[PDB]
Amino acid sequence: VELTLSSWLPPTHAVVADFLMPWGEEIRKATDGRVTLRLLPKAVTNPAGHFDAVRDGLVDVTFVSHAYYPGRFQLTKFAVLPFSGDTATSRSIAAWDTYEKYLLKADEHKGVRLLGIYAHGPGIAFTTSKPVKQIGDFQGLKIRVGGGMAADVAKAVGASPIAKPAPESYELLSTGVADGVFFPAESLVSFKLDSIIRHATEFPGGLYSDTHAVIINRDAFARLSKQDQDTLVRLSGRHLAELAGRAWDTHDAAARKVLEGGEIELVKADDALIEAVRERTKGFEQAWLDAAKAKGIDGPAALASFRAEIKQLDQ
Numbered sequence: 001v002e003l004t005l006s007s008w009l010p011p012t013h014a015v016v017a018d019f020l021m022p023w024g025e026e027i028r029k030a031t032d033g034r035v036t037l038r039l040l041p042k043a044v045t046n047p048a049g050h051f052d053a054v055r056d057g058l059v060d061v062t063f064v065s066h067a068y069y070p071g072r073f074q075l076t077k078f079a080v081l082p083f084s085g086d087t088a089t090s091r092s093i094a095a096w097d098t099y100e101k102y103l104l105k106a107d108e109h110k111g112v113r114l115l116g117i118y119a120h121g122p123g124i125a126f127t128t129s130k131p132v133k134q135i136g137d138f139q140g141l142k143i144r145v146g147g148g149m150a151a152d153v154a155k156a157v158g159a160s161p162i163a164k165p166a167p168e169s170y171e172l173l174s175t176g177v178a179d180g181v182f183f184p185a186e187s188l189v190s191f192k193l194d195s196i197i198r199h200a201t202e203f204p205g206g207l208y209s210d211t212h213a214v215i216i217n218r219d220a221f222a223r224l225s226k227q228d229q230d231t232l233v234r235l236s237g238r239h240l241a242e243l244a245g246r247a248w249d250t251h252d253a254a255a256r257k258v259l260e261g262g263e264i265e266l267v268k269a270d271d272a273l274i275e276a277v278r279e280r281t282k283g284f285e286q287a288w289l290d291a292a293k294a295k296g297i298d299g300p301a302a303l304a305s306f307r308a309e310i311k312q313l314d315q
Ligand SMILES: O=C(O)[C@H](O)c1ccccc1
Pocket: 065, 067, 120, 145, 146, 147, 150, 164, 165, 166, 182, 183, 184, 187, 209, 210
């Protein structure tokens, strides 16, 4: 069985080059070639369309951003709140472990098999020409966001979110439609924004983050032997979360040569700015609790579990 894989990111991106490709090699080797992943040479549809591409059987495997589906992945938001996680590795592992233990029964990923979830690193506020040093500096900025938490944060701090998938960021910024972008560090470089962006403000534990899901068509999974199904599952979940998180973190760290290099004015959010953002976003947790209750899950348990686990990992 050869599983087709569609990606809406360039093949050189961390997610593909340093996560999905090595992961596919792990699957091949662990099933003696009986299961392989074939990366299709083009995206088969637009980024948000990738969930349905899998569900409809157009491709066997993909990754989807939880930000790209307004209303549909509300339960993932516990993992991406402002100021909550130092690295993609710790957040990915804690996000998956929490989702697997408490949230799977809510069926947010209806119609496909959910293999695993990961998160990227700390979100940064990047802008083309306008520094962000006090809360008022966000007012009116048109900021490209994925959607989801990034969008919730942009709106809360008084910016005007432009919710579009990541690959649109270069066009929107280069043409001056957007004033800025919420991205993790690596994206500054992989999306080729570092000759446009001149300003960045970093926040302890991130301004926000985003989670992705790796999914497989259910009929395709059913084509594997029981042993190979078990193997694919063993190589997914927490194992996948760690593999992906490590890729993101490695790319984030590489990107610091550009962040720290002098052409970008690099700001560390001061205590006043952080507190102003906390104050604007203070209701987000209760919003998530309310959604958790609506979905029939143990909100306080899941939230407490995630926090305990990420705090420990981060140590
Ligand atoms: O901002 C987004 O669109 C999303 O979080 C994302 C997707 C892919 C790379 C970086 C970030």
